UniProtKB/Swiss-Prot annotation:
May play a role in alveolar type II cells through interaction with the surfactant protein SFTPA1 (SP-A). Belongs to the annexin family. Monomer. Binds to SFTPA1 in a Ca(2+)-dependent manner. This is Annexin A4. The modification N6-acetyllysine is found at residues 203, 283, 290. GO terms for molecular function: calcium ion binding; calcium-dependent phospholipid binding; carbohydrate binding; chondroitin sulfate binding; heparin binding; phosphatidylserine binding. The gene is ANXA4.
Length: 309
């Protein structure tokens, strides 16, 4: 909020938590209305102003889904990224959907810090953890991205770029699983300027847009990420929305994802994602999140959304 005081409102985060039960309806009407920076500032305050460690108290009196979400809002940015990718990183199927929605989506200086922390917090790095838990070819894409060796200068190299689209047909006809230099690099190496412009010469050299062809040559998780990168690097909020739709859709809700997206993306482009949902899925994301959730769990999300229409 405008002119915030960590300790003062932190005295309410305590007042409300006080006594068996909790006044959760007001947690949203303080915590969900601050920026993250200010939230962690609440943390500083609740430490010295109360004396217990806030994050745990939240986590020692809040129920289920409302804990993973308030938690996400209460966590600092890179640590939502590091701790998330960790969460995602093994079990069954490695929620490679998250490793697809945590790598493609961050910029190269953004991915790099996160490696340093997934090493640090735990002991051994992202790519190490990637190599077992993700496999074979799709692994490659992930390995490339987690390193972060990607061109940052917005610049079009008209020849290698025109050559690259040429190659994406070469390594277009061979499932994109041949000559492990194109599909990976061409997408996971050259700056969005050089990238989309080859995306001008593939819609030309090939008459079949790079999108379509990625789906009709390639298949599976590989395809998900290769194709994730195209969405992130053409319009990132249209992918965060494609994801949203792609969580809240279907039998039941695939909570976790929508949780990490809602929490995370909440402060970069939610009024942007939202437009690419009004058109893309002819309705609002608000209302999508309205019928597919419960009480103050939905209610705080109707605020990480930020409203209807």
């Amino acid at each position: 909020a405008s002119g915030f005081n960590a300790a003062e409102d932190a005295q309410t985060l305590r007042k409300a938590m006080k006594g068996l039960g909790t006044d959760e309806d007001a947690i949203i009407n303080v915590l969900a209305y601050r920026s993250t920076a200010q939230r962690q500032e609440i943390r500083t305050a609740y430490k010295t102003t109360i004396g217990r460690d806030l994050m745990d108290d939240l986590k020692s009196e809040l129920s289920g889904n409302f804990e993973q979400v308030i938690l996400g809002m209460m966590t600092p940015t890179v640590l939502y990224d590091v701790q998330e990718v960790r969460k995602a990183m093994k079990g069954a199927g490695t929620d490679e959907g998250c490793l697809i929605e945590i790598l493609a989506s961050r910029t190269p200086e953004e991915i790099r810090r996160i490696n340093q922390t997934y090493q640090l917090q735990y002991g051994r790095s992202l790519e190490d953890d990637i190599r077992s838990d993700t496999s074979f070819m799709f692994q490659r894409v992930l390995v490339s991205l987690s390193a972060g060796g990607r061109d940052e200068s917005n610049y079009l190299d008209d020849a290698l770029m025109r050559q690259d689209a040429q190659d994406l047909y070469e390594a277009g006809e061979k499932k994109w699983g041949t000559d492990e230099v194109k599909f990976l690099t061409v997408l996971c190496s050259r700056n969005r300027n050089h990238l989309l412009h080859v995306f001008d010469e593939y819609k030309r050299i090939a008459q079949k847009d790079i999108e379509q062809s990625i789906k009709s040559e390639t298949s599976g998780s590989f395809e998900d990420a290769l194709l994730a990168i195209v969405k992130c690097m053409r319009n990132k909020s249209a992918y965060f929305a494609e994801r949203l739709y792609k969580s809240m859709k279907g039998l039941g809700t695939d909570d976790d994802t929508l949780i990490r997206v809602m929490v995370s993306r909440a402060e970069i482009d939610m009024l942007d994602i939202r437009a690419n949902f009004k058109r893309l899925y002819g309705k609002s994301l608000y209302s999508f999140i309205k019928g597919d959730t419960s009480g103050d769990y939905r209610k705080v999300l109707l605020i990480l959304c930020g409203g209807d229409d």
